Design a protein around this ligand. Structure first.
Ligand code: CA
Ligand code: CA
Ligand code: CA
Ligand code: CA
Ligand code: MG
Lengths: 735, 146
């Protein structure tokens, strides 16, 4: 934000060597306060009247309390402050004249001053006692009732104790002062005048110079960021939709700091938040049953799927049950079912949460049962007294969608083995991503290795050796029988979390069972709200897929943290066949990048496998072979573009030698685009390719001499029979 | 176990460089089918694969003889992915390009003291088109090319 703009560089130094002289007198901070408030200063040549490019109809003269003394003859001005939004101070100069009667340049200070008052200290935090009591210097503190310079028509009211009883009414008048005080303290002439008349405003202004100006130039610099930020609801305001159990989130807070790495989580269902604290273990990869959000079972994985969200989905349920069975079938000993035993607190919880209604009681087989009501319309429920088991049956006037009908049975839930004990299951902590600091990964590499790497004489090979190191010990992710797909640190990290939520009190085992959704290449999910725990310990919850993205770019991507994103982004994940978008820098630059031999041949193969017709068909038309022979020609130029011997050249040549090779390709493309019946599909492609090349070559030009436009440059070339001198021509064109 | 799509390429390419349009390629011809595909066997590493099957007139593979040749070195490799993530890591600003400024930067947090000289130097040797920066492509090359 370059604060000052010099319009006309017309007069010799005189004009300039005047504006400078003007500003070099105003404190660097007083300027920083300006720029900070977003202001800009305008020094222009002869533009007295409403003539400046910013001197037209907006907030102009509304009420008339103008200069030091009030005047308002506008047209007779040379200095002005565009009062309303960002402060726009505009000043113009003419001949060699401010020093003789500095009584003129002083307005450049007050005219300015109205810059910082009303947003300085006089009122910027509020009329903070500092200025509120300093203002009291009317006639109560010092024996200096010499405020006749700033308090005339508006404060000859010496007969009125000026504290909070009256200062508000005229915030404005107390500016006319801070200004003149400013104009005086800095006026090239009368500085002492301020020090000899009002004795405090001098010290006030002085402290301001002392550092008082760097003050606001910070409480504003700081509120510079905090203001315009990324709206995420931080703190427990987030920890609420987070889902995670607070004692845990906190437990986590430690790791984040120690290891220095952002921890991100997807939404953890609220209806399981407590089943967790309670001690219910969490769902691993082994189980694929659907949770539930209603009735007693809510927040558990009902072995009976008609008792979960997909209640009614005669096919989801039909395939849902089908999944708990296999879950058990396949992983016996570790996965099976047990009776739903809602405990104490849970009941009162699903109560004020309106999931279940505890009422009328009843008797059966000699045991007590408190009927557990639920506005469901096919299943009735009741919980025991002896043990809190829960049961249900098909109402006498309904049926199960699968076509089942039964009497009081217990509600069984899925449960994993945990210390030789089938504990019931609920939602887990599905990490969305883990972003360790680059420095952290550095401490993941075994010194000797990183050493054997750096202790090399090959400048470029070193870089490589490192990158691989960084790749091996940091970006690589392997598969796993147990924890899904993840990295190694990812795993050591995955532990520290559970052990962290263990020395807390959890007795359900683990709460984080697998790798980050960033490896959910299979069935990627898109959650609007993402909970994140920075390396500092603060809680955060984004609101959009975009904000999360934006957030990650500002705090992780371009700060010093390692982060990779789901390989299936911007592609079409097979499993759920979903397209989830995520900003990719490489793609950003694609438009301006000539394609590669392979990237080219690829896009051909592609289309072939779509409009079954290929660039060239296996036939005899000597026109076909023309085409074949001709793409083989492109798949050569493009290949030549990216030559690794291009190093024995200089930057200057590279662009040239390349821009040419580039043009070469572009040519043979125009050549085939002007061929026989090349399917219109390929036609479009080549049209696409052309543009790249174009963009590329342009970019390569702009790096050098730039009055040349690909279009022109191309014309001037001749790719008829002799390509030879053509290149010598080319060079000549770029001089 | 190459995918079908993974196959179409290996043909589109394998054919394009089949001059005498039959369905078999010479040795030099193989060298080129792959080079173009963005790979590159060594002058001698080029034989041991083709050389390994000699039923076509000793020194010429068919379409399968080739397709089935895309296992030895392929039913293992997947680095092409990491390398692209390595790249997004050094491109600290999101421009799709890696500047010497950011090389030096990431290069040091990882704990390497690089001389302001020896950076503008790496960047240079990785730059092929001469625009001073290294793009995913130039990068991909510098990495894999051995
Ligand atoms: Ca042949
Ligand atoms: Ca043979
Ligand atoms: Ca960059
Ligand atoms: Ca480049
Ligand atoms: Mg999970």
């Amino acid at each position: 934000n370059n604060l000052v703009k010099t319009e006309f560089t017309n007069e010799t130094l005189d004009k300039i060597q005047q504006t400078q002289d003007l500003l070099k007198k105003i404190p660097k901070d007083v300027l920083e306060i300006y720029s900070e408030l977003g202001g800009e200063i305008y020094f222009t040549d002869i533009d007295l009247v409403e003539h400046k490019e910013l001197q037209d109809l907006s907030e102009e003269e509304k009420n008339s309390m103008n200069s030091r003394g009030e005047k308002v003859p506008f047209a007779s001005r040379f200095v002005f402050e565009k009062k309303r939004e960002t402060p726009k101070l505009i000043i113009n100069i003419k001949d060699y004249a401010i020093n003789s009667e500095q009584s003129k340049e002083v307005y450049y200070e007050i005219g300015k001053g109205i810059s910082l008052d009303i947003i300085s200290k006089d009122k910027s935090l509020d009329p903070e006692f500092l200025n509120l009591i300093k203002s009291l210097s009317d006639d109560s503190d010092s024996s200096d009732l010499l405020f006749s310079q700033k308090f005339k028509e508006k404060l000859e009211l010496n007969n009125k104790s000026i504290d909070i009883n009256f200062i508000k009414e005229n915030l404005t008048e107390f500016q006319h002062a801070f200004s003149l005080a400013f104009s005086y303290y800095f006026a090239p002439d009368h500085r002492t005048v301020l020090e000899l008349y009002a004795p405090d405003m001098f010290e006030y202004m002085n402290k301001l110079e002392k550092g008082g100006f760097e003050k606001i130039s910070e409480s504003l610099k700081k509120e510079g960021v905090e203001k315009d930020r990324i709206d995420v609801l931080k703190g427990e305001k987030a920890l609420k939709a987070s889902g995670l159990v607070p004692e845990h989130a906190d437990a986590f807070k430690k790791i984040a700091r120690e290891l220095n790495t952002y921890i991100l989580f997807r939404p953890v269902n609220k209806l399981a938040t407590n089943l967790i604290k309670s001690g219910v273990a969490t769902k691993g990869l082994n189980v694929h049953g659907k949770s539930s959000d209603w009735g007693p079972v809510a927040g558990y994985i009902p072995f009976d799927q008609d008792l979960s969200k997909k209640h009614g989905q005669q096919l989801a349920v039909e395939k849902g049950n089908l999944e708990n069975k296999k879950s058990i079938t396949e992983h016996e000993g570790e996965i099976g079912k047990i009776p739903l035993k809602l405990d104490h607190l849970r009941i009162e919880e699903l109560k004020e949460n309106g999931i279940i209604l505890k009422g009328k009681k009843e008797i059966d087989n000699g045991k007590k049962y408190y009927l557990l009501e639920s506005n469901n319309q096919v299943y009735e429920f009741r919980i025991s007294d002896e043990n809190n088991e829960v049961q249900y049956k098909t109402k006498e006037g309904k049926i199960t969608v699968l076509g089942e009908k039964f009497n009081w049975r217990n509600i069984e839930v899925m449960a994993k083995n945990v210390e030789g004990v089938l504990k019931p299951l609920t939602a887990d902590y599905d990490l969305f991503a883990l972003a360790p600091s680059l420095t952290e990964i550095k401490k993941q590499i075994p010194q000797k290795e990183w050493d054997k790497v750096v202790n090399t004489p090959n400048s470029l090979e070193k870089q490589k050796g490192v990158t691989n190191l960084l790749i091996k010990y940091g970006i690589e992710r392997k598969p796993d029988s147990t924890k899904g797909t993840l990295s190694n640190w990812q795993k050591q990290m995955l532990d520290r979390l559970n052990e962290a939520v263990k020395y807390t009190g959890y007795t359900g085992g683990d709460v984080v069972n697998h790798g980050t959704e960033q490896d959910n290449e299979e069935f990627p999910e898109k959650d609007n709200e993402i909970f994140i725990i920075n390396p500092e310990g603060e809680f955060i919850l984004t609101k959009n897929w975009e904000m999360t993205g934006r957030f990650i770019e500002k705090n992780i991507t371009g700060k010093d943290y390692l982060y990779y994103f789901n390989r299936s982004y911007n592609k079409i994940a097979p499993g759920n066949k979903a397209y989830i978008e995520w900003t990719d820098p490489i793609t950003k630059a694609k438009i301006n990048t000539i394609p590669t031999s392979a990237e080219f041949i690829k896009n051909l193969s592609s289309i072939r496998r779509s409009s079954n017709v290929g660039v060239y068909k296996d036939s005899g038309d000597k026109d076909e072979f023309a085409k074949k022979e001709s793409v083989k020609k492109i798949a050569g130029y493009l290949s030549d573009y990216y030559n690794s011997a291009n190093h024995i050249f200089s930057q200057e040549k590279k662009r040239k030698i390349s821009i040419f090779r580039g043009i070469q390709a572009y040519n043979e493309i125009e050549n085939v685009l002007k061929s026989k019946q090349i399917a219109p599909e390929y036609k479009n492609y080549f049209q696409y390719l052309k543009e790249r090349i174009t963009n590329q070559v342009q970019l390569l030009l702009t790096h050098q001499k730039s009055n040349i436009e690909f279009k022109l440059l191309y014309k001037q070339l001749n790719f008829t029979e002799n390509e030879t001198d053509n290149f010598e021509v080319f060079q000549k064109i770029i001089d | 176990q190459l995918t079908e799509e993974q196959i179409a390429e290996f043909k589109e390419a394998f054919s394009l460089f089949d001059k005498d349009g039959d369905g078999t390629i010479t040795t030099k011809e193989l060298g080129t089918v792959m080079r173009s595909l963005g790979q590159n066997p060594t002058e001698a590493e080029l034989q041991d694969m083709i050389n390994e099957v000699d039923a076509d007139g000793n020194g010429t593979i068919d379409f399968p003889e080739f397709l089935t040749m895309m296992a030895r070195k392929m039913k293992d490799t997947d680095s092409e992915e990491e390398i692209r993530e390595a790249f997004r890591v050094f491109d600290k600003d999101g421009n799709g390009y890696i500047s010497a400024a950011e090389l030096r930067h990431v290069m040091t947090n990882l704990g390497e003291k690089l001389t302001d000289e020896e950076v503008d130097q790496m960047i240079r040797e990785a730059d092929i088109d001469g625009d001073g920066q290294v793009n995913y492509e130039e990068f991909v090359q510098m990495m894999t090319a051995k």
